[PDB]
Write a protein that holds these residues in place. Structure first.
Motif, PDB file in Angstrom:
ATOM      1  N   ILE A   1       0.825  -1.210   0.000  1.00 58.93           N
ATOM      2  CA  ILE A   1       0.000   0.000   0.000  1.00 58.93           C
ATOM      3  C   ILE A   1       0.865   1.268   0.000  1.00 58.93           C
ATOM      4  O   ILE A   1       0.565   2.254  -0.680  1.00 58.93           O
ATOM      5  N   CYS A   2       1.911   1.261   0.809  1.00 60.48           N
ATOM      6  CA  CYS A   2       2.800   2.404   0.886  1.00 60.48           C
ATOM      7  C   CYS A   2       3.579   2.633  -0.412  1.00 60.48           C
ATOM      8  O   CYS A   2       3.885   3.777  -0.759  1.00 60.48           O
ATOM      9  N   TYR A   3       3.828   1.566  -1.166  1.00 62.43           N
ATOM     10  CA  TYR A   3       4.557   1.710  -2.422  1.00 62.43           C
ATOM     11  C   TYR A   3       3.781   2.590  -3.404  1.00 62.43           C
ATOM     12  O   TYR A   3       4.394   3.309  -4.188  1.00 62.43           O
ATOM     13  N   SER A   4       2.448   2.570  -3.318  1.00 63.13           N
ATOM     14  CA  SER A   4       1.602   3.408  -4.176  1.00 63.13           C
ATOM     15  C   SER A   4       1.307   4.704  -3.434  1.00 63.13           C
ATOM     16  O   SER A   4       1.101   5.752  -4.041  1.00 63.13           O
ATOM     17  N   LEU A   5       1.322   4.640  -2.108  1.00 59.72           N
ATOM     18  CA  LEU A   5       1.017   5.801  -1.279  1.00 59.72           C
ATOM     19  C   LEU A   5       2.075   6.893  -1.157  1.00 59.72           C
ATOM     20  O   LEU A   5       1.776   8.069  -1.356  1.00 59.72           O
ATOM     21  N   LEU A   6       3.285   6.515  -0.764  1.00 55.27           N
ATOM     22  CA  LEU A   6       4.365   7.479  -0.554  1.00 55.27           C
ATOM     23  C   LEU A   6       4.665   8.459  -1.689  1.00 55.27           C
ATOM     24  O   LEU A   6       4.907   9.651  -1.447  1.00 55.27           O
ATOM     25  N   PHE A   7       4.671   7.957  -2.920  1.00 50.96           N
ATOM     26  CA  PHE A   7       4.950   8.782  -4.095  1.00 50.96           C
ATOM     27  C   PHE A   7       3.889   9.856  -4.355  1.00 50.96           C
ATOM     28  O   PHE A   7       4.204  10.965  -4.806  1.00 50.96           O
ATOM     29  N   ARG A   8       2.635   9.526  -4.059  1.00 45.74           N
ATOM     30  CA  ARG A   8       1.534  10.457  -4.252  1.00 45.74           C
ATOM     31  C   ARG A   8       1.490  11.527  -3.168  1.00 45.74           C
ATOM     32  O   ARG A   8       1.074  12.652  -3.429  1.00 45.74           O
ATOM     33  N   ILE A   9       1.917  11.176  -1.958  1.00 47.87           N
ATOM     34  CA  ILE A   9       1.965  12.144  -0.860  1.00 47.87           C
ATOM     35  C   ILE A   9       3.096  13.132  -1.206  1.00 47.87           C
ATOM     36  O   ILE A   9       2.927  14.346  -1.138  1.00 47.87           O
ATOM     37  N   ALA A  10       4.250  12.593  -1.594  1.00 46.11           N
ATOM     38  CA  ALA A  10       5.399  13.425  -1.944  1.00 46.11           C
ATOM     39  C   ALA A  10       5.112  14.319  -3.147  1.00 46.11           C
ATOM     40  O   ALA A  10       5.706  15.380  -3.303  1.00 46.11           O
ATOM     41  N   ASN A  11       4.212  13.865  -4.008  1.00 43.33           N
ATOM     42  CA  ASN A  11       3.818  14.619  -5.195  1.00 43.33           C
ATOM     43  C   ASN A  11       2.847  15.751  -4.815  1.00 43.33           C
ATOM     44  O   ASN A  11       2.566  16.641  -5.611  1.00 43.33           O
ATOM     45  N   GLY A  12       2.352  15.711  -3.581  1.00 43.09           N
ATOM     46  CA  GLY A  12       1.449  16.742  -3.101  1.00 43.09           C
ATOM     47  C   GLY A  12      -0.034  16.471  -3.269  1.00 43.09           C
ATOM     48  O   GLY A  12      -0.840  17.400  -3.256  1.00 43.09           O
ATOM     49  N   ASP A  13      -0.410  15.213  -3.459  1.00 42.08           N
ATOM     50  CA  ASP A  13      -1.817  14.878  -3.639  1.00 42.08           C
ATOM     51  C   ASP A  13      -2.611  14.926  -2.341  1.00 42.08           C
ATOM     52  O   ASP A  13      -3.817  15.164  -2.359  1.00 42.08           O
ATOM     53  N   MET A  14      -1.947  14.655  -1.226  1.00 40.58           N
ATOM     54  CA  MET A  14      -2.610  14.625   0.071  1.00 40.58           C
ATOM     55  C   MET A  14      -2.894  15.958   0.785  1.00 40.58           C
ATOM     56  O   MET A  14      -3.999  16.165   1.301  1.00 40.58           O
ATOM     57  N   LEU A  15      -1.924  16.860   0.827  1.00 41.26           N
ATOM     58  CA  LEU A  15      -2.120  18.115   1.538  1.00 41.26           C
ATOM     59  C   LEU A  15      -2.084  19.377   0.691  1.00 41.26           C
ATOM     60  O   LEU A  15      -2.254  20.473   1.218  1.00 41.26           O
ATOM     61  N   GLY A  16      -1.961  19.226  -0.623  1.00 40.47           N
ATOM     62  CA  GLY A  16      -1.909  20.383  -1.496  1.00 40.47           C
ATOM     63  C   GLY A  16      -0.574  20.558  -2.199  1.00 40.47           C
ATOM     64  O   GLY A  16       0.482  20.260  -1.656  1.00 40.47           O
ATOM     65  N   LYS A  17      -0.632  21.104  -3.410  1.00 40.90           N
ATOM     66  CA  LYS A  17       0.552  21.334  -4.228  1.00 40.90           C
ATOM     67  C   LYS A  17       1.460  22.440  -3.687  1.00 40.90           C
ATOM     68  O   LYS A  17       2.560  22.658  -4.193  1.00 40.90           O
ATOM     69  N   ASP A  18       0.967  23.174  -2.703  1.00 39.66           N
ATOM     70  CA  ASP A  18       1.711  24.265  -2.094  1.00 39.66           C
ATOM     71  C   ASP A  18       2.196  23.911  -0.687  1.00 39.66           C
ATOM     72  O   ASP A  18       2.752  24.756   0.010  1.00 39.66           O
ATOM     73  N   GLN A  19       2.000  22.660  -0.281  1.00 35.05           N
ATOM     74  CA  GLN A  19       2.370  22.218   1.066  1.00 35.05           C
ATOM     75  C   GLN A  19       3.575  21.284   1.138  1.00 35.05           C
ATOM     76  O   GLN A  19       3.482  20.117   0.802  1.00 35.05           O
ATOM     77  N   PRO A  20       4.731  21.794   1.582  1.00 34.46           N
ATOM     78  CA  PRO A  20       5.921  20.939   1.674  1.00 34.46           C
ATOM     79  C   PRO A  20       5.709  19.855   2.730  1.00 34.46           C
ATOM     80  O   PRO A  20       5.079  20.106   3.751  1.00 34.46           O
ATOM     81  N   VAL A  21       6.253  18.665   2.506  1.00 36.98           N
ATOM     82  CA  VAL A  21       6.095  17.598   3.470  1.00 36.98           C
ATOM     83  C   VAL A  21       7.412  16.964   3.910  1.00 36.98           C
ATOM     84  O   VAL A  21       8.389  16.950   3.161  1.00 36.98           O
ATOM     85  N   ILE A  22       7.441  16.498   5.156  1.00 38.91           N
ATOM     86  CA  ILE A  22       8.589  15.776   5.708  1.00 38.91           C
ATOM     87  C   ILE A  22       8.028  14.374   5.992  1.00 38.91           C
ATOM     88  O   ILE A  22       6.978  14.248   6.609  1.00 38.91           O
ATOM     89  N   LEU A  23       8.685  13.332   5.500  1.00 42.16           N
ATOM     90  CA  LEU A  23       8.205  11.964   5.705  1.00 42.16           C
ATOM     91  C   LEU A  23       9.026  11.208   6.739  1.00 42.16           C
ATOM     92  O   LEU A  23      10.230  11.035   6.585  1.00 42.16           O
ATOM     93  N   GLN A  24       8.361  10.721   7.774  1.00 42.62           N
ATOM     94  CA  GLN A  24       9.036   9.956   8.817  1.00 42.62           C
ATOM     95  C   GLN A  24       8.453   8.564   8.661  1.00 42.62           C
ATOM     96  O   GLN A  24       7.301   8.315   9.012  1.00 42.62           O
ATOM     97  N   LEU A  25       9.238   7.693   8.030  1.00 45.38           N
ATOM     98  CA  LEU A  25       8.828   6.330   7.710  1.00 45.38           C
ATOM     99  C   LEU A  25       9.198   5.278   8.742  1.00 45.38           C
ATOM    100  O   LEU A  25      10.342   5.218   9.193  1.00 45.38           O
ATOM    101  N   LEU A  26       8.242   4.405   9.055  1.00 48.37           N
ATOM    102  CA  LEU A  26       8.452   3.358  10.045  1.00 48.37           C
ATOM    103  C   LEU A  26       8.237   1.945   9.517  1.00 48.37           C
ATOM    104  O   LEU A  26       7.299   1.677   8.772  1.00 48.37           O
ATOM    105  N   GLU A  27       9.125   1.046   9.922  1.00 43.96           N
ATOM    106  CA  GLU A  27       9.067  -0.363   9.564  1.00 43.96           C
ATOM    107  C   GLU A  27       9.535  -1.150  10.767  1.00 43.96           C
ATOM    108  O   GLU A  27      10.114  -0.586  11.691  1.00 43.96           O
ATOM    109  N   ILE A  28       9.280  -2.455  10.754  1.00 43.69           N
ATOM    110  CA  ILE A  28       9.717  -3.311  11.846  1.00 43.69           C
ATOM    111  C   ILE A  28      11.240  -3.296  11.872  1.00 43.69           C
ATOM    112  O   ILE A  28      11.880  -3.078  10.845  1.00 43.69           O
ATOM    113  N   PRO A  29      11.846  -3.553  13.041  1.00 44.70           N
ATOM    114  CA  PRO A  29      13.303  -3.560  13.202  1.00 44.70           C
ATOM    115  C   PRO A  29      14.108  -4.525  12.336  1.00 44.70           C
ATOM    116  O   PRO A  29      15.299  -4.302  12.120  1.00 44.70           O
ATOM    117  N   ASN A  30      13.469  -5.566  11.814  1.00 44.44           N
ATOM    118  CA  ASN A  30      14.168  -6.558  10.988  1.00 44.44           C
ATOM    119  C   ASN A  30      14.948  -6.029   9.790  1.00 44.44           C
ATOM    120  O   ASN A  30      14.446  -5.232   8.998  1.00 44.44           O
TER     121      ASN A  30
END
Ligand SMILES: NC(=O)c1ccc[n+]([C@@H]2O[C@H](COP(=O)([O-])OP(=O)(O)OC[C@H]3O[C@@H](n4cnc5c(N)ncnc54)[C@H](O)[C@@H]3O)[C@@H](O)[C@H]2O)c1
Ligand SMILES: NC(=O)c1ccc[n+]([C@@H]2O[C@H](COP(=O)([O-])OP(=O)(O)OC[C@H]3O[C@@H](n4cnc5c(N)ncnc54)[C@H](O)[C@@H]3O)[C@@H](O)[C@H]2O)c1
Lengths: 327, 327
Positions: free
Chosen positions: B15-44
C-alpha cells in the motif's frame, strides 16, 4: 476539453501499476485534460485477467478525468486513434538467454507494434518507449512506422536524468528543484553519461562548487549508472515507481513545455554532435508547443568524447543485431 | 508554507509503495504544502533494507515538495512531532491463525503505537488507521492515547465508499463525479452498509432512477462487500493502489474540506444514530477547517437498522476481544 486517447502496453505489469493511476489522476497531461486509456497486454489468460483486476482498481479510485478505458490483446485495436503511446511492455532477459536472443525477441515485439501504430494511430501520435532496450526498441518501432514522423519516436532517459539530479542535490546540499542545465547523453544503460559541466544552482557553477572531478568520474557516474542494481539489491525487485514517475515527466514536459529549462530526451539524431542520423540518443533539449529542440553549441572535451563514443558504440552494436528484422 | 511532518507505518509494504509517491507529489495536503516523511518499519534487517530501497526511489523522483525524509525502527522516534499519521502497518492473518490470535497480535501493535503518539506527536495530530482490522485498531490506538483528542483517531471506510461510487456510476451510466450524498455505515468489512437512499445525480434520486431495490440487496451490496476478494482473484494480490488512493482521499478531504459535500469517515461515535459512544464507526460527514461533522436527521428504515445492527455487532465482538489488552 476533448479527451486524449492514451495507449499503454504491458498494462498488467509493475511499472504500469504505479503509472496508470497517476495518468488517470491527471499528472501526465494536466488536471484539465480528460483521458481515455486503451490498455494492452499479451493474449494469455493470466495476463488478461490481471489486466482486468487493475482496471477494477482504477474504477475504484473514482477519477473524474477518466473518460474511458478499454482492454486489448491486439496492438491493432489498442493503438486505434491513440494520441499518445507508452510502450512499456517488452521481453525481459532470462536464464541462458544471450544478448542476441534478447534483441531479437524484442525486435519482433516492436516491429509489430510499430506497424500497428503506423496503420491505426493518430497521424501525429507521440510515442515513448520505456521497455528495454529502450533506445533500440524505439528505433525498431520508428523504422517500422514509415508513414509517421520519425521525431515522434522517443526513448526514456528521464530516469537516468532524475537519478543524476538526486545525486547532485545530495552532494551540494541544495534542493533538487534548484538545479538547472543538467542532462544525460546516450543510451539508457550503465554507459549513459550524466553531464554536469553546464549545470547551475542559483546561477553558480555546480562543477566549480564541487571542485573535485575525481568525484565526478569515480563516484557520480558509477552510482547513477548502477542505481537500478542498487534498488534491486535493496527491495528485491526493480525500480517500478521511479521509472513510472520519469515516464510522466517525459510526456508532461514534451507536451506542456519546459519553459526554457533543459531536459533529457532519447530522440532520433539529426546529426548534431557527430551522432549518426536516425540513432535514438539521449540529448539535452528544451520543449515548447509539443515539439523539442536540441540544445546546440555545447563544448565536447576529450573526456566527454570518450564517454559519448562508448555509449554510441553500444547503440551501434544493438542496431547491427536487429538490422535483419527490419524491412 | 511551513512543512508538515507525516508519519507513515508499514513503509516497505505494498500500500505504501503506491502511497508514498503520491503524498510526496502533493496529492494529500496540497501542491503548495511541503512535506517531511518519517517512515516506520519493523526492526528486521530485511524490512529496513527494503525501506531504504523505497527511499532511494523517492529521491530519484526529484519531488520539489519533499522537504525531508527519515527512516525509523522505533515508533517513539517515528511519531516525533508528527502532524499527520497513517497507520498502515499491521499483522496479517496466516495459516492456523484464529480470529482471537489476529486481534491480539494487532492489539499489541496498536497499543504501543498509540502510546508513542500520545507521548511524542503533535498535540493535535490527525490519525488515520488503514491496517486491518481498521476500525478496531483505531479504537485501540485512541484508547491508548489519553492525552490526545479522541475525534483525531479515524479509520478508513473511504475505499468502501469509492467502490460503492464506482458501482453506482456503472449502473446509472452517469459520471462517477456527478454522484452526491452516497455514503457507507459501519465496519470496514463485508458487513459494511453502502447506503444509496439519499444519493443524487443532477438533483435526481439515484434510488428512483434505478427503481429496483432487489438490485440493491442482491447485487450492489454483495459486490462492494466482496470487491477486495474479486481483485485478489484477478491480480493474485491485494488492491494496494486503490487503497492508497482512498487514504489520500480521506486525509485530503479531512484537512482541506468537502465544501458541503458528504463523505464517509470511520470516526468515534458520539452516540448519533444509537451507536454507542467510543465505537469507531462509518458515518456520513461533511468537513471544514480540519474538522468533521456527522450528518444528522437521516431516516433509518427497518432494512437499514438490520444492516447497521450486523456491522455494529461485529465491531462489538472485536472490541470484546481486545478489551483485556487495554489499561
Ligand atoms: N527505460 C527505463 O528507464 C526503464 C527502467 C526500468 C525498467 N524498464 C523496462 O520496462 C519494461 C517493463 O518493466 P516492468 O517492471 O513493468 O515489467 P513487468 O514484467 O512487471 O511488466 C511487463 C509487462 O509487459 C507485458 N508484456 C510483455 N510482452 C508484451 C507485449 N508484447 N505487448 C504488451 N504487453 C506485453 C508483460 O506480460 C508484463 O505484464 C521492461 O523491459 C523493463 O526492463 C525501463
Ligand atoms: N482499511 C482498508 O481499506 C484496507 C484495505 C486493504 C488492505 N488493508 C490493510 O492495510 C494493511 C497493509 O496492507 P499491505 O498490502 O500494504 O501489506 P504489506 O504486507 O505489503 O505491508 C505491510 C507492511 O507493514 C509492515 N509492518 C508490520 N508490522 C509493522 C509494525 N508493527 N510497525 C510498522 N510497520 C509494520 C510490514 O513489515 C509490511 O512491510 C494490512 O493490514 C491490510 O490488510 C486495509
Amino acid at each position: 476539453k476533448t479527451p486524449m486517447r492514451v495507449a499503454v502496453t504491458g498494462a498488467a505489469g509493475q511499472i504500469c501499476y504505479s503509472l496508470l493511476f497517476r495518468i488517470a489522476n491527471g499528472d501526465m497531461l494536466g488536471k484539465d485534460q480528460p483521458v481515455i486509456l486503451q490498455l494492452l497486454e499479451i493474449p494469455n489468460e493470466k495476463a488478461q485477467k490481471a489486466l482486468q483486476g487493475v482496471m477494477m482498481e482504477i474504477d475504484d479510485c473514482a477519477f473524474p478525468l477518466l473518460a474511458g478505458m478499454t482492454a486489448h490483446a491486439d496492438p491493432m485495436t489498442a493503438f486505434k486513434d491513440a494520441d499518445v503511446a507508452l510502450l512499456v511492455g517488452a521481453r525481459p532477459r532470462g536464464p541462458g538467454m544471450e544478448r542476441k536472443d534478447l534483441l531479437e525477441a524484442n525486435a519482433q515485439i516492436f516491429t509489430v507494434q510499430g506497424k500497428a501504430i503506423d496503420a491505426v494511430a493518430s497521424r501525429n501520435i507521440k510515442v515513448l518507449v520505456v521497455g528495454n532496450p529502450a533506445n533500440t526498441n524505439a528505433y525498431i518501432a520508428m523504422k517500422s512506422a514509415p508513414s509517421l514522423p520519425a521525431k515522434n519516436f522517443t526513448a526514456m532517459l528521464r530516469l537516468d536524468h532524475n537519478r543524476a539530479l538526486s545525486q547532485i542535490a545530495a552532494k551540494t546540499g541544495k534542493p533538487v528543484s534548484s538545479i538547472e542545465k543538467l542532462f544525460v547523453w546516450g543510451n539508457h544503460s550503465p554507459t549513459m553519461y550524466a553531464d554536469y559541466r553546464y549545470a547551475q544552482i542559483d546561477g553558480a557553477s555546480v562543477k566549480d562548487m564541487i571542485n573535485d572531478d575525481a568525484w565526478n568520474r569515480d563516484t557520480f557516474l558509477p552510482t547513477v549508472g548502477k542505481r537500478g542494481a542498487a534498488i534491486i539489491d535493496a527491495r528485491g525487485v526493480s525500480s517500478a515507481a521511479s521509472a513510472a514517475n520519469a515516464a510522466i515527466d517525459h510526456i508532461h514536459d514534451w507536451v506542456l513545455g519546459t519553459a526554457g529549462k533543459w531536459t533529457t530526451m532519447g530522440i532520433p539524431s539529426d546529426g548534431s554532435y557527430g551522432i549518426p542520423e536516425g540513432v535514438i540518443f539521449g540529448f539535452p533539449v528544451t520543449t515548447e508547443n509539443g515539439e523539442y529542440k536540441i540544445v546546440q553549441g555545447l563544448s565536447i572535451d576529450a573526456f566527454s568524447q570518450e564517454r559519448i563514443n562508448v555509449t554510441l558504440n553500444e547503440l551501434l552494436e544493438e542496431q547491427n543485431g536487429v538490422q535483419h528484422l527490419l524491412g
